[PDB]
Each structure stands twice: as C-alpha cells, then as structure tokens.
Amino acid sequence: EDPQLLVRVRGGQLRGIRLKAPGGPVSAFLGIPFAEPPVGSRRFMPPEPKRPWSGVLDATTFQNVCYQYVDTLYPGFEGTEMWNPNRELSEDCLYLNVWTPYPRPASPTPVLIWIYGGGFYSGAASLDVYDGRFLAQVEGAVLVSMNYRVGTFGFLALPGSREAPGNVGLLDQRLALQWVQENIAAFGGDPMSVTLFGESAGAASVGMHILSLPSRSLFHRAVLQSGTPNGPWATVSAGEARRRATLLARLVGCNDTELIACLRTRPAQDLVDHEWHVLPQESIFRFSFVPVVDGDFLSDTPEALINTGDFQDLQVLVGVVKDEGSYFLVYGVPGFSKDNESLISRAQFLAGVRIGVPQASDLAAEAVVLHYTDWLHPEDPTHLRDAMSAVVGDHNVVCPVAQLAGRLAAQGARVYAYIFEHRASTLTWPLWMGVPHGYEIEFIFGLPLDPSLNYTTEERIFAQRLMKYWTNFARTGDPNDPRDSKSPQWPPYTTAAQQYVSLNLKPLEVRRGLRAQTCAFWNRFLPKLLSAT
Amino acid sequence: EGREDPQLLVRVRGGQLRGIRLKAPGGPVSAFLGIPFAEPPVGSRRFMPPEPKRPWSGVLDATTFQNVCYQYVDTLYPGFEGTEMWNPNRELSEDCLYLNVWTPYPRPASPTPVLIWIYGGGFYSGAASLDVYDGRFLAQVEGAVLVSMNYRVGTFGFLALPGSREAPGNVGLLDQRLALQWVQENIAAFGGDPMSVTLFGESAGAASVGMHILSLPSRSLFHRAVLQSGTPNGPWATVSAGEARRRATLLARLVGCNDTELIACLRTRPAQDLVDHEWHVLPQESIFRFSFVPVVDGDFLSDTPEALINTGDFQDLQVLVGVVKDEGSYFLVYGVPGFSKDNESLISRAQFLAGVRIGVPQASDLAAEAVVLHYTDWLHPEDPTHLRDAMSAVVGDHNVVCPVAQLAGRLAAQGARVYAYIFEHRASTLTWPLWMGVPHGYEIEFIFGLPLDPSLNYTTEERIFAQRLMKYWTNFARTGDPNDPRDSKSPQWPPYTTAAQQYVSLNLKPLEVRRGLRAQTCAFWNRFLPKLLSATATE
C-alpha cells in the first residue's frame, strides 16, 4: 500500500492511483464525491455536501458522467466522438478529480481548476482532452476538475420556485470550489492560489463565478477560453426560462410545486428526449437549458454586471481560436458538411444568417449580410462559406470576448488576450474548417507530449510553451516567463492599445485590435438597430 | 469687312460673327466668344424656358466673353486664389445666355469631333469664361472643336413651382439643351462634326451631363458623355416636386410675396434680392446641399434619376466617369466647425459627430450613428488626425464617390460602355493645405491643359501629364475609347464592369488598374443606408 496514494480529506480517506506520464509518475485521485447525489427528490435542487464515509474510498477510477444528450450526427467519427461521454451516464455524477505530482509536492502548489464546456447540455471531466497528468508532471501543478449537472438537470429553472431555483449546475461548481478550498492543502495544493480555467460553456461558467460574490472568495485568477458570461447564448432571462421549463413539462406530460413534482417522476432519457425541442427558433449556437438571470447567483444580466463591476484585484487570461464558427455550421446550416468543402450560394448564405443570428430582425439580418459580403466577390462561394463561419464565430465568441476584455481592463482587471492559430496535424476535420472551436485544449493540457499520440515534434515544443503560459499565469497572474529575456513579451490587453498575441508555432507576435471594426458592429451598432426594431 | 482677317469671319443661323485669333503655347487658335443662343431671359421671361435667339443684323463681334449669369459670389476667403479662381470674371446679369467656340486656326479641313463643356457650381454659380475652362489648349494641341455655354443658375435657372406655366423648373437644363441644339445646327460652320458630340462637365456640370443622358429630347443631341465628380443620382443633384415647391414658396416670402400671382411678384424683385436670400431656404444646416437644383418634374425628368438609371437602356452609350482622391475635404472648410484652410484642422470626436449631422443632413439619429460607427477607427476612436480625414471621406463618399460607383454599376449592367478613373495628383501650384489632398475641382485644369502655359509655373512632368489627360479625353470624344490605338505598349485602360469593377489611377506614374470603387463602403451608402430609413420625424 503506497502511502503517497493515501490521503485524508474532511470526509474520510481516499486511495488514489499512480499513473505514468511520459517523463514521470503522477498521483491521481479520480471520482471523489463532493455532493450527495442529486437524485430522486434532489433533482433540480441546489447540491448538498457529501456526508462523511467509513474506511478508504477507492478513488482510482473516473466516476459517471452527468446525464446528458449524446451526439449522433457523425456516428463513430473521431471528431465528434472525442466530446461524447466516455463513462456510464447517470444522474449520480457529482464527483471531482485531482492530479498532483508524484511524490506529493512538498511546498503548497498553485491549483488549476478546470471547468469543461459542452453547451450547458453535455461534457464530462473524464475526456482524454482534459487529462491532467501532463500539467501535474511537467509543471508540478495540482490540477482539479469536476463534473457538474448539465441540461435540464443542471439548468431547468422555474424562477422563484423553491424546488427548481435554477443555476444548480453552477452551484455544483461552486460546491467543488469550496471543496478545493477545504481539502486541497492535503494533496499539496495551495488554497490561496486557485486559478479557474475553462472553455466555451466552461469559460462562461468561470465568467459567472467572477460575476457572483459568494464565488469570489474561492479563487484568485480566471482563464476564459472561447466563451463568456455575456453574449447571446450563455444566459436567459427568468421569463424565457420559465417559458422553456413549462414547455418541456407540457412536452412530457406535466402552479410550480406540482409541475416540478411530475418532472421528478420522469426517467432521465425522457427529459433529454425533449430538451432540444424548446428553442424559440431554428438556431445554431443556442442552447435550451443554461444559466438564468435569477437575481440570486446572477443579480443582473452579465452585461449589466461587467459594465459596472469592480475588478481591481483580478487577473484574467482570455482568448479565441482562428475559426470559432466553422464547427457549428455542419450542425444546422444547409450546404455545410465535413465531407465536402461547403461552397455555398449567395442564397444559402442569407439563409445561414437567419440561423446563426436566429434572433435577428429582417433588417438586422440584412445588415449582417451587407457587412460580411465581399463586394468584389459578392457571389464567390469560398468567401460566402468563410464569411458564414466568421458571422457565427464573431457573434458568439470573438466579439463577446472583445467586449469582456475591454470592460474588465477598463474596470481595474489585469487582462491578457490571445488568439490561437495552430491547426492540429492530427485533426479529423476538413481544411476549410481551419482551427475550429475546441482544438486548443489538447495543446494547453499537454497531450502532444504523449508520443503514442502521433503529434509532430514542433507541436510537442508548442505544447510546452502553452503549459508554461497557463501555469505561469496560475502562479503569478502573468503568463510571461518570470526569468527569461527576449520573447517578445505578452503585453496586458488594455482599452487604449487593445493588444493580444497570436499563439502558433512561430514566436509570440503582438497584434492590436480583436476584429475591432467588426466587433463595433456587433457590440455597438447591432443592439441599437434592434432597440428600435 | 475688307481689311479684317479672312479666317475669323463665320456665319451662323443667327447671322454673322467676327471671332478672334488667340495665342496658345504651340500656335494660334480661332475663338468665337459671347455668341448669343437664346433671347435674354429677362423681365417677363425670368424663370421661363429659353426662347431661341432671334437673328441679328450685320457682323456680331465675338471677340470677348459675355456676361455671367446672375449668381451668388463666395466670400469665405476674400482675395485667396483658391476661391477667387471660381468667382465670376465678367459682369453679372440676367442677360446671360451666350456660348463660346474654340477651333484650330485655321479651321479644320475635315469635320472635327466636338467637345461641349458644362460648368459646375452647385447650380447656383459658374461661368464658361473662367480661365480653367479655357479651350485654347485642347483646340490647338488636339485639334478639338470646343464649345461651352452659360446657363441660368440659382433661382433664375431652377426655382420652380412644379406644374405651373410660369415657373415649370429646370429651365437651366433647358438653356443647356438649347445650346446643344445650337451646336447641331451650327457647329459645321466652324468645322465641327455634329454627328460626333461629347458632353463633359464637372460636379453640377457632371450631373447636368447625367440628366441629358436621362432625358429623351436631349439624347439625339450628343453621342458620348464624361461625368467628372458628379452624377444625376445622389442626394444633392435633384429635389422632389414638393420640396421644390416648398423652397420656392419660402423664398417668395423672404422677399415679400395661386402660383401665377406669386411668380408675377417674384418677377418684379431685383435679381440681387433673390440671390441674397436663396441660401436661406435649405431645410437643415448642411454642406453639399444647394437651394435650387433640377426638380423631378415628371417632364425633363420622367422619374427620379435613381429610378431612371435602374431601368433605362443604354446600349448606344459610351461614358467616362471618375473622382479625385479627396472629394470631400474642400467642403469641410466651408461649413464644418473645426475646419480651416489655415491650420491642420485636427478635430475631436465631438466635432466629428457634429460634422456627420451636417454632412449627412437628411439622417435620422440612427442612420447618423451608423455612419459614425462605420467611419470611426475603433483602434483610435479619439485620434484628431484620423477623425479629420474620416469627416472628409464621409462627405466625399456620400456625395461623389458612391453615387458615381452606383452610376458606373447601373450603366455597365444596362449595356453602356463605361470607363472609370480616380485622379490622384496634387497640382504643384495648389493654394490649399496638404491635409486637403487632391481636392474637389482640381483636375479640371489638367484636363484643359493649363499646365502647357509656361507662364503658369507648372512642372515639366505636370506638362507631360496634362497632355496625357488631353489624349485620353479627346481619344474618348473621338472613338468612345480613351485608349491610344497607336501606342499600345503603355498600359491599357479597361472598361468598368459589374464583375471586375476596374478603374485606372490618373497621376504622374503610368496607368495603374485597380478593382473596386470603395466597394465595401459604397455598399453601406448605396444599399444599407436607404433601407435604414424606416423612420418618421426628419424631412
């Protein structure tokens, strides 16, 4: 019995497992419970802390993935499959994973906490792309990741009700955050240096912990990759949540208490079966059950709160990939497929715009078309395709990121911004997709260092640079190597100069303006256009 | 006659003319200046369509320029050559309607293709007798026959109570048409070829050329057309019948006045009282808007220019159109607070927003914001230098470049052969400041070949340049193609097409071909902005 794999937290004793990372061993403790299983009558409710346990809990295996939709679009395609749950689905899924250096760090080590994305309708902390051994081994990080309820289970809300208050998904997260506070010191972790990082819906989640006071005592720095609390997709009004919760309850056979009661009787697959039939329009990049502006967790819209927050003792690193939009086009936009080259007609392009910006008025959609049309090549199908991609990425990720960076820096936060520009040599999608949403993650988490993964060698070198920025960021709130001249340096994003770096195989290059003209359209003009229908 | 010079006496349908032997740098030209082509539109004829000139007796002396049409004189920079060059240079008068002719000396053997110049001046000023419109050079160096006419500007030429008998509107255009007819009847006596007539004009003249293209009765009077920095479509060249009626009425009031009885009173007003007041009838504080312009009468203009270019057939037509680099800088200096010819005009964001409301006076609050949004550089939204130049572009794009782009597009698509250019050379002898770039109106002097006059102090490259321009222009008059048929070594000037949207740059360097006339930005003005209207409260 290896005493390096024996740990004692407030709940009892855990045995982890020793794992091989290319250049060493790591202690790993997987499937640690941090909540009483949110099942039966617990469904839709705030999580309660796990009761203590006898003996030695076996923590050497990933626990069950929270009950969620599973993608069938491209059945057995590596590209969509890598996101799909890789353990058994179950409502009983409130477990978290810790990775540490083996042997347990001697001095308290910065803690990175990873929040998976997945549209607020999917995701699990057990996917290979979230494998923490590399950062633990190479950078001596203590790295934590948790599961949190998704879909109806995590985000169905009857605002005001006692039994479905909304936001329980984020409460699951918050609870895991408390747990890290209360227990991480025992794995060598420094509860006084906790950096959250997450991607997409996970970046939004991190964003919400920033914007919710009770969360703020639980971490010190945040990294939002390719997602924001602000923007078109990450929240809903309490009215629109009440509307969808009712619609779904009608859809499956069901005053508040009585209604939530009946939903509690339905098998999980029945809710997931109808989850997606409640979107107001035919959308892409728009999700049925998401964090709701409840005036509790969120006291006001994210935009309200980022416009008026005080963020002085905050450091944030934020970023996007070169081709945020491409991924989403094959999931709802006619003319787009991973198998051809998705060259489209002017017609399909106007069609694609009413879907990407599903909430647009006729005139607003015309404006989008006019802005993205290349009037030298107004009918060229390569441009039309590439443009469609940008409309979707810009609207949902890039511009919301630009706005978040700008509002944070202006209100005292220290901000670093990036754009990730390297396309994996191992990528299973077509070239026209560029560098799609989600494919920086494998690099940040250090996957290329696993030789059997068939990544090139410059990619392994690149992976180490990233692990370095991210972990430096976690140590110090500055991604720059603290000793090591000549880089050049990664400057803080500011409203004045608007600088951010490209992350690719070449050295850091500083650029100014994150699609500034185009984002002015989305962040400034577009909203006036509609606030006058 | 008897002792006279035999090569200077010509007969026209009106009677006998004695012209004058002018000196050009390379030799003599024949000039016939101040030939009357209409009855004096005076007294009871004020506001009325020109009546053809009754024949006279004896030999009419045609050796000097005649009167300039009664007009407002600009006094922003009193004494400054940059503004005085445009000011009237012969006496002001309602007896006004005269044209000029320059021909080689002696006159051409075979019939020579004719150029007709139509001056601009906002439809409230201009004269064919200005030095920059001197046809002595094109006549001498290219062998061209050049004609230019005075036409009524301001109230006298454009005040209208649409529908009425006594002030139908557009009579300034009719002065112009009457002179084209005159060229048809008479240009043969000078060696002109009535079957080869090319109109060209600038700014408001350009728009007039445009309106002859769009008006059936004018079409039989010319064959090709050049529009320099102006179009018939666009926000300033025309007004609705209602707007024209409203401006006419207001102006009547301001000077103390059933249409008949109202016009009668207008006809008793001294010309100067009308000039002193015309500028007050504008609806908003604005730049690049003029009180009295062609009205859409359902007559000279059957429909709006926008409508007519969007439909008409233009198979028979060849057209050359273009713009200067900095169309709008000239205009800021007149009426946008922050701007001057005497400092660098660095402005603030506030002054920019203010300037947009003035430069785009018809704009609802939203449309104006759309403009500021498009033109702001969001990396440096506060930068005085960037703002200064953006304000210039806003005015230049809204008034010349995008209407011109619009027009090239529609004409090309409707079977016209179109050639387009942007003129990018700043005259070495310009009295405006560098910030203004190459301003509105300052290519004219190169097209007319003034730099060939050694006394004018242009550079040698500038002399060679001007001749190049004169070749393109005359070649175009001649053949409907600016390109030199002989010298095909030097780069060629492609037609502008819907597809490739090719135009050339005119500067000291040889032709360079470019694609897209401010294409992204003109999509905003020509497509989005209209739709963005979809509001009720302005006017």
Ligand SMILES: *[C@@H]1O[C@H](CO)[C@@H](O)[C@H](O)[C@H]1NC(C)=O
């Ligand atoms: C041009 O140059 C001469 C000699 O330097 C000068 O006297 C004259 O006034 C100048 N004329 C013009 C038109 O600039």
